[PDB]
Amino acid sequence: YSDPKEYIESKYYDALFSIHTPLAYFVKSNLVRLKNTCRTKYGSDSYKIAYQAMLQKFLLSIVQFKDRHDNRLLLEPFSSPIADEKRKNCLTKFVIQDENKNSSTIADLCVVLKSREIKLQILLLLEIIGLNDLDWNFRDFEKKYKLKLKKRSLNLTKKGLVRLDYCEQLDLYLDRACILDILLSSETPNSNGTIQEHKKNILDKSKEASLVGFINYVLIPYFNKKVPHAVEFIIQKLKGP
Amino acid sequence: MYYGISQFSEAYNKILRNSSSHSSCQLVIFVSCLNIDALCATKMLSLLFKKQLVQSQIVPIFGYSELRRHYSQLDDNINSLLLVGFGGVIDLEAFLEIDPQEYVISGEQSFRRDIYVLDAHRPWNLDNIFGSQIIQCFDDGTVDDTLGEQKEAYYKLLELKQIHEYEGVLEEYYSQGTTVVNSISAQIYSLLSAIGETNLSNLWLNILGTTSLDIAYAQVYNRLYPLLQDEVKRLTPSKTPDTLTLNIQPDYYLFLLRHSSLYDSFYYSNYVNAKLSLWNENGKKRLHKMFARMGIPLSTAQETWLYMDHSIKRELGIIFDKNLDRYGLQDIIRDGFVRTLGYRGSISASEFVEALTALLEVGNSNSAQKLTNLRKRWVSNFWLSWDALDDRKVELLNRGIQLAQDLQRAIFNTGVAILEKKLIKHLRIYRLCVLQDGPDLDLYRNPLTLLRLGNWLIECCAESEDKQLLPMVLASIDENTDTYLVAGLTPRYPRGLDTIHTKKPILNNFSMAFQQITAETDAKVRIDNFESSIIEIRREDLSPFLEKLTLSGLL
């Protein structure tokens, strides 16, 4: 409530670390209050320039996301006391106040937070895609991407020789989300530990924590009318051909 | 440098000259360990240097890992090294750590060792072709006919305001995927014809190496086929229990029809499984609708090829011509090459290729240096396939027919379970297939079988149009060692694959990306097949591996 900068910082890390609360709360109330706030301080127009500029500062590049989740570094202290407190409190609830922990508990807490922040970053991306009127890109995304595909193939060659793009970012996050789901299913393991029960919701299509539940409970309700092509694009990728 | 097609006999004389300068063996042939075209080409060469007393030596080379090691141990007596089936796409001078002056010890520039490259893979490495005197490649005419723009851009070797975007020319050239554009055995047979050494055994080995191109480069085989039939048609000597007679007969594109049953020849064909989708149940019913429309009862089609009535076998031709194209399986009708030794049962070239592939993959049927157990198993798989090229060793050929039938059936059952469980999921630049144990034959501890299951999945799955152009990554967990076996496959061009108007995948150098990611992965077992494919990693290393793969070529 102090500074909208530190308000959305409070509400982002609240949405990330509070595993029980649904991500629909972050979309329906947190992001709306922030959009209402930039409205007042910047007028009825030319406030999207400030509303997106603030969301952009919480948008993680796919490279930043991996360095952030590698080696369980997400459980390591954050610089800002605002973000660091939400980290410690979730630790108190899931790793410290759960008795007869297994060594799987820390790993289970990170994969839960990793799959959750993927969806969280997809939300920021979908919001930025709407503010910049980029939803048209998701009609024949496979057919338009062939130009950048040629750039990537040429770049692979550039290393063994001489001897910004929010839609690609959304595609990369969806790819990363699918790898998490495929390996969590193939791991096999043929309430509970409260951190465990949350890990099981990642594959339960009844829950918002799953991809199907994230679509039906967050994406379709709150994003289908603002970014309909991207929602259909996300569906076609997660459902699969 | 390179030799044109005209200069093949000239280069052969250079090898015959330098290798016959001493009774001692100064000729070594490095064979690509696991491809039939190279296997038969060196057999033709060795027989050439054996029918004509040149002491040669055959060394199976699995990958560039084994190439660098085996070259560093070549005794200095060897003045002639032959690389068959590999090396053309890499800078051999740079890779082998060769200083051309350390070898300078009449005319041109004469070295103590000449390293010849007999390779049908493309694109040619421009250093081997235009920037090396000791590396001597046997060219297809590819250089003279296609490499004009790249030769100009390469020879801009200025070293010293104004700019030069010849770098972009060579970038597009080296971003092409690796393909095969010829048969090495067909090139060797052209050398034997120029020097008048074409016996029927050489033509059979020529047919075998060329026929082995039909599984992945069908349009290369279709291009070399008329000259093959021309040679077989030419040799018309109209006995011995060792008389070798070749004949052009219908050799249908079914899986070992004459060594199993008419039903199993269809049911286990990767071609008809792609056109009918036999992995589900609606597809198998249509195979039975096909036999019913053919007038062939199922109990007769399921009889062994021997016991089956000849009345049906003599009508199989016309029956195929009226019923197959309705189901889009016209490519089954195909004429092939058949070899008969004396008065024994005849063998097909495509059937011969199936047996050599089974022998090369499962012939014999502390993770540190556990790769050695794989190495020793692979080189003995090579020598089994090398021995199977002896006409008097019919027992080896017949066991490969059985291994091929057991191998394909296991591949079928595993892949059918993968397709019906919808395991292959789909990322932007590759398809992912994560296997757990896999209750059939060997958890794929044998790494070459995992590649064949991937090729099976690439071939027989539908997966629309936009999607089979995508590479496939396969991961198989070994719950006993808690490790994944990961392999990367680029889709190839088998016989029954429609080729018209379709385009090469925009990112055709995926094997380059897969190689780069493995080179920065903690591999507990590092396997180097020539096109960069298989590693073994811990379970928790697979997630970062697949994630990095999705970022290939981004930054």
Swiss-Prot record, chain A:
<comment type="subunit">
    <text>Interacts with CDC45 and SLD7.</text>
</comment>
<protein>
    <recommendedName>
        <fullName>DNA replication regulator SLD3</fullName>
    </recommendedName>
</protein>
<comment type="function">
    <text>Required for loading and maintenance of stable association of CDC45 with chromatin during initiation and elongation of DNA replication. Also involved in temporal regulation of origin firing. Required for the association of PSF1 with origins.</text>
</comment>
Curated annotation (Swiss-Prot), chain B:
<dbReference type="InterPro" id="IPR003874">
    <property type="entry name" value="CDC45"/>
</dbReference>
<dbReference type="GO" id="GO:0006270">
    <property type="term" value="P:DNA replication initiation"/>
</dbReference>
<dbReference type="GO" id="GO:1902977">
    <property type="term" value="P:mitotic DNA replication preinitiation complex assembly"/>
</dbReference>
<dbReference type="GO" id="GO:0003697">
    <property type="term" value="F:single-stranded DNA binding"/>
</dbReference>
<comment type="subunit">
    <text>Assembles into a complex with MCM5/CDC46. Interacts with MCM10.</text>
</comment>
<dbReference type="GO" id="GO:0003682">
    <property type="term" value="F:chromatin binding"/>
</dbReference>
<dbReference type="GO" id="GO:0043596">
    <property type="term" value="C:nuclear replication fork"/>
</dbReference>
<comment type="similarity">
    <text>Belongs to the CDC45 family.</text>
</comment>
<keyword id="KW-0131">Cell cycle</keyword>
<keyword id="KW-0235">DNA replication</keyword>
<dbReference type="Pfam" id="PF02724">
    <property type="entry name" value="CDC45"/>
</dbReference>
<dbReference type="GO" id="GO:0003688">
    <property type="term" value="F:DNA replication origin binding"/>
</dbReference>
<dbReference type="GO" id="GO:0005634">
    <property type="term" value="C:nucleus"/>
</dbReference>
<protein>
    <recommendedName>
        <fullName>Cell division control protein 45</fullName>
    </recommendedName>
</protein>
<dbReference type="GO" id="GO:0000727">
    <property type="term" value="P:double-strand break repair via break-induced replication"/>
</dbReference>
<comment type="function">
    <text>Required for initiation of chromosomal DNA replication. Acts at the origin of replication. Also has a role in minichromosome maintenance.</text>
</comment>
<keyword id="KW-0539">Nucleus</keyword>
<keyword id="KW-0597">Phosphoprotein</keyword>
<dbReference type="GO" id="GO:0071162">
    <property type="term" value="C:CMG complex"/>
</dbReference>
<dbReference type="GO" id="GO:0031261">
    <property type="term" value="C:DNA replication preinitiation complex"/>
</dbReference>
